[PDB]
Design an enzyme around this catalytic site. Sequence first.
Site, PDB file in Angstrom:
ATOM      1  N   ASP A 127      -4.855   2.530  -7.585  1.00 55.16           N
ATOM      2  CA  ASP A 127      -4.080   3.723  -7.385  1.00 55.16           C
ATOM      3  C   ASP A 127      -3.182   4.107  -8.551  1.00 55.16           C
ATOM      4  O   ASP A 127      -2.001   3.890  -8.499  1.00 55.16           O
ATOM      5  CB  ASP A 127      -3.249   3.467  -6.141  1.00 55.16           C
ATOM      6  N   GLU A 163       2.047  11.962  -8.732  1.00 57.85           N
ATOM      7  CA  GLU A 163       1.466  12.035  -7.387  1.00 57.85           C
ATOM      8  C   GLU A 163       2.336  11.300  -6.380  1.00 57.85           C
ATOM      9  O   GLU A 163       2.491  11.758  -5.240  1.00 57.85           O
ATOM     10  CB  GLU A 163       0.034  11.459  -7.356  1.00 57.85           C
ATOM     11  N   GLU A 164       2.917  10.161  -6.773  1.00 61.12           N
ATOM     12  CA  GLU A 164       3.610   9.327  -5.816  1.00 61.12           C
ATOM     13  C   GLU A 164       5.043   9.792  -5.587  1.00 61.12           C
ATOM     14  O   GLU A 164       5.683  10.425  -6.445  1.00 61.12           O
ATOM     15  CB  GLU A 164       3.624   7.860  -6.272  1.00 61.12           C
ATOM     16  N   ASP A 210      -9.271   8.560  -5.834  1.00 60.54           N
ATOM     17  CA  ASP A 210      -8.035   7.853  -5.540  1.00 60.54           C
ATOM     18  C   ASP A 210      -8.363   6.585  -4.756  1.00 60.54           C
ATOM     19  O   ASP A 210      -9.180   6.625  -3.847  1.00 60.54           O
ATOM     20  CB  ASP A 210      -7.106   8.736  -4.704  1.00 60.54           C
ATOM     21  N   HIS A 292      -0.393  -0.389  -2.114  1.00 57.85           N
ATOM     22  CA  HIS A 292       1.052  -0.378  -2.352  1.00 57.85           C
ATOM     23  C   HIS A 292       1.651  -1.765  -2.219  1.00 57.85           C
ATOM     24  O   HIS A 292       2.821  -1.909  -1.859  1.00 57.85           O
ATOM     25  CB  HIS A 292       1.767   0.663  -1.451  1.00 57.85           C
TER      26      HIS A 292
HETATM   27  C1  LIG Z   1      -3.345   8.871  -1.212  1.00 50.35           C
HETATM   28  C2  LIG Z   1      -2.109   8.117  -1.701  1.00 50.35           C
HETATM   29  C3  LIG Z   1      -2.147   7.170  -2.658  1.00 50.35           C
HETATM   30  N1  LIG Z   1      -0.910   6.709  -2.875  1.00 50.35           N
HETATM   31  C4  LIG Z   1      -0.102   7.356  -2.015  1.00 50.35           C
HETATM   32  N2  LIG Z   1      -0.847   8.233  -1.307  1.00 50.35           N
HETATM   33  C5  LIG Z   1      -0.295   9.148  -0.294  1.00 50.35           C
HETATM   34  C6  LIG Z   1      -0.257   8.594   1.146  1.00 50.35           C
HETATM   35  C7  LIG Z   1      -1.224   8.955   2.065  1.00 50.35           C
HETATM   36  C8  LIG Z   1      -1.181   8.455   3.351  1.00 50.35           C
HETATM   37  C9  LIG Z   1      -0.170   7.612   3.742  1.00 50.35           C
HETATM   38  C10 LIG Z   1       0.819   7.254   2.823  1.00 50.35           C
HETATM   39  C11 LIG Z   1       0.773   7.758   1.541  1.00 50.35           C
HETATM   40 ZN   LIG Z   2      -0.136   5.205  -3.951  1.00 51.13          ZN
END
Ligand SMILES: Cc1cncn1Cc1ccccc1
Ligand SMILES: [Zn+2]
Length: 323
Positions: A127, A163-164, A210, A292
């Site tokens: 990610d 993005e985050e 992603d 994460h």
């Molecule tokens: C796709 C993504 C990758 N890193 C964070 N997201 C966003 C997300 C999506 C769903 C639940 C929590 C966070």
């Molecule tokens: Zn993420």
Amino acid sequence: ASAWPEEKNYHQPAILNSSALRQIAEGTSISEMWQNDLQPLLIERYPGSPGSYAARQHIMQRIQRLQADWVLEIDTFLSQTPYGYRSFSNIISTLNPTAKRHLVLACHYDSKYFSHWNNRVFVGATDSAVPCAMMLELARALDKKLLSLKPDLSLQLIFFDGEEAFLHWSPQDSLYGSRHLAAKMASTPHPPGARGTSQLHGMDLLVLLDLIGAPNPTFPNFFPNSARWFERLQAIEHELHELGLLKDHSLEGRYFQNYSYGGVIQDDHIPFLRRGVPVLHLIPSPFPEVWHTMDDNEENLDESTIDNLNKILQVFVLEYLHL
Ligand SMILES: Cc1cncn1Cc1ccccc1
Ligand SMILES: [Zn+2]
């Protein structure tokens, strides 16, 4: 006004034959991707950090050494965050910036911000360092074929910044770079001189990668209107398997399942989706087990799964571009 914005609706691939598939499969080196494109990105690279600028320099450099005529713009902007204003920079790499239509590949190149935990550093391998590397590899592996571009359609890469979420996922703390670039494109006339059409219209299809890199991903088909392009990914996976071109791969555990997801996973595509851009969202459900965590690193990546998806993706792009 102008109806070109409807051409993507009727666009159709130029399916490759077994000889060409083999060629493509031969044309991509997973181990060169891993050394030259992927490893330099496995650093802390949250927006505004030194690693962000490093990652940004490495993406532009790798893209620069290639023969195809990539135009690179750094779309730099300011936005409010839970910690105040901050500066972000999306990377945009385009072949033939003049053409009305473009197939878009993209991902995010920031890593989620997290202070040291147990003396470990979050680098988000899946990610989305790996999606970044797959984009660089696709461009190298297809360099010569893309050079052929000098249907009015070419290829664009977008590496989104921010993005985050910095503190807590929300509409105002997330998707910084994509919220910015979607509103910018939606109000930039395209092609140059147009009076009624935008760059956002020129986005033939947004292929968003992603959370790629774990073993056994299962990608759902998320949207009723890009479903046919999802079906091409299914078809290409199948044929490459039958031709012995994939490694450690079974049709019992195929990536592109025949199941749909009735909702949406919030990501960089949402700003474009809400304005009507068609999207192929290449994110797996469920998320990698290391999502994460400090374990979303190089050692938990699966080399074969990325090799296989590189081949499927490269075939998909050439078939979309009629190359
Ligand atoms: C796709 C993504 C990758 N890193 C964070 N997201 C966003 C997300 C999506 C769903 C639940 C929590 C966070
Ligand atoms: Zn993420």
